Design a protein around this ligand. Structure first.
Ligand code: CL
Ligand code: CL
Length: 326
């Protein structure tokens, strides 16, 4: 009757219950609605940071943190970031943000990731004051910069079009120092969310005094940990609908959108949006470094198994960083 009692891993493993702690899509996060000028738009709402996530645009991995196009610029030239503002509030460094919120005792003492999320949640340049729409952000650890994203869309890569602006989310070496941040990133993510890969360990299920192996896994070959993390991210919880290209409007009207609402509704049509993951998906992977197998599964793990052949990763986890001790 009590097969699941007496688990020594309960508090340790709370951060790997991704459905509980994150609660939205990982690959594509569009878990909430928000009204802007009496019109619903989808936006990111996941509670954990996504380490290593960026958006590849038109086969380019150096583009999406560039500002969006405005007026005379072509749409394909720009990226997803906030355009220049007065005052210039994006990009902003960690020290810039600490100074900017220095009279808010809560916000000024936040960690870098939560501070970037809250900064992005405060700034609304279009000036819909009474509105719950809050932009997502990307923090760059290399130069300690918070970039607010004007475009909350994450995937537009279907077989019909892709004159159309095409893009997809991915883990990639050029995205290693990025962190994708929704408006809901919690201030205690260090305690309750995954970050580092667990060396000499694999995920299991606690059953009757024993940490048993995951009974059914989907085996994908992978040359290293990076490629295993990349595959887990591709299979992870996703809020993107099936048939979205039908509901996309004409691209001439979208281009006219980028002469300064039509930008924010460009690749997120109402007809497409049922499709919310709520964090459910193939979010975890046991990487055997000896057999070069990424063992991917969709049930929450409830313990770890010590094994020197393995590294335990999740779709939220950083693709490189490993926690050595165990
Ligand atoms: Cl610092
Ligand atoms: Cl500075």
């Amino acid at each position: 009757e009590a097969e699941f009692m007496g688990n020594p891993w309960t508090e340790y493993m709370a951060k790997y219950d991704i459905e509980e702690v994150h609660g939205s899509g990982i690959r594509v996060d569009l878990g909430e609605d928000a009204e802007v000028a009496g019109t619903q738009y989808r936006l990111p709402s996941g509670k954990c940071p996504v380490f290593g996530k960026g958006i590849i645009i038109e086969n380019s991995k150096t583009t999406f943190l560039k500002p969006v196009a405005t007026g005379n610029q072509d749409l394909k030239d720009g990226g997803f970031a906030f355009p220049p503002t007065n005052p210039l509030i994006s990009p902003m460094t960690l020290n810039g943000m600490r100074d900017f919120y220095k009279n808010n005792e809560y916000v000024k003492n936040l960690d870098e990731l939560t501070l970037c999320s809250r900064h992005a949640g405060n700034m609304n340049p279009d000036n819909d004051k009474n509105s719950n729409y809050k932009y997502p952000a990307v923090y760059d650890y290399n130069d300690k910069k918070c970039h607010i994203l004007y475009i909350a869309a994450q995937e537009n890569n279907g077989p019909r079009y892709c004159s159309m602006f095409c893009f997809r989310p991915a883990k990639d070496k050029l995205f290693e120092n990025y962190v994708y941040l929704s408006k809901n990133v919690v201030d205690n993510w260090e305690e309750v969310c995954p970050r580092k890969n667990l060396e000499n360990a694999k995920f299991g299920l606690w059953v009757d005094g024993n940490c048993e192996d995951i009974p059914h896994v989907n085996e994908f070959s992978a040359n290293d940990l990076f490629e295993c993390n990349k595959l887990v991210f591709e299979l992870s919880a996703s809020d993107q609908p099936k048939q979205y290209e039908q509901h996309l409007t004409d691209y001439e009207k979208i281009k006219e959108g980028f002469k300064n609402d039509m930008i924010k509704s460009a690749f997120l049509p109402t007809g497409a949006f049922r499709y919310k993951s709520h964090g459910k998906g193939y979010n975890w992977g046991n990487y055997n470094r000896e057999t070069q197998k990424c063992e991917i599964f969709n049930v929450k793990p409830t313990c770890l198994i010590n094994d020197k052949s393995y590294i335990a990763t999740t779709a939220l986890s950083h693709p490189i960083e490993v926690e050595h001790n165990f």
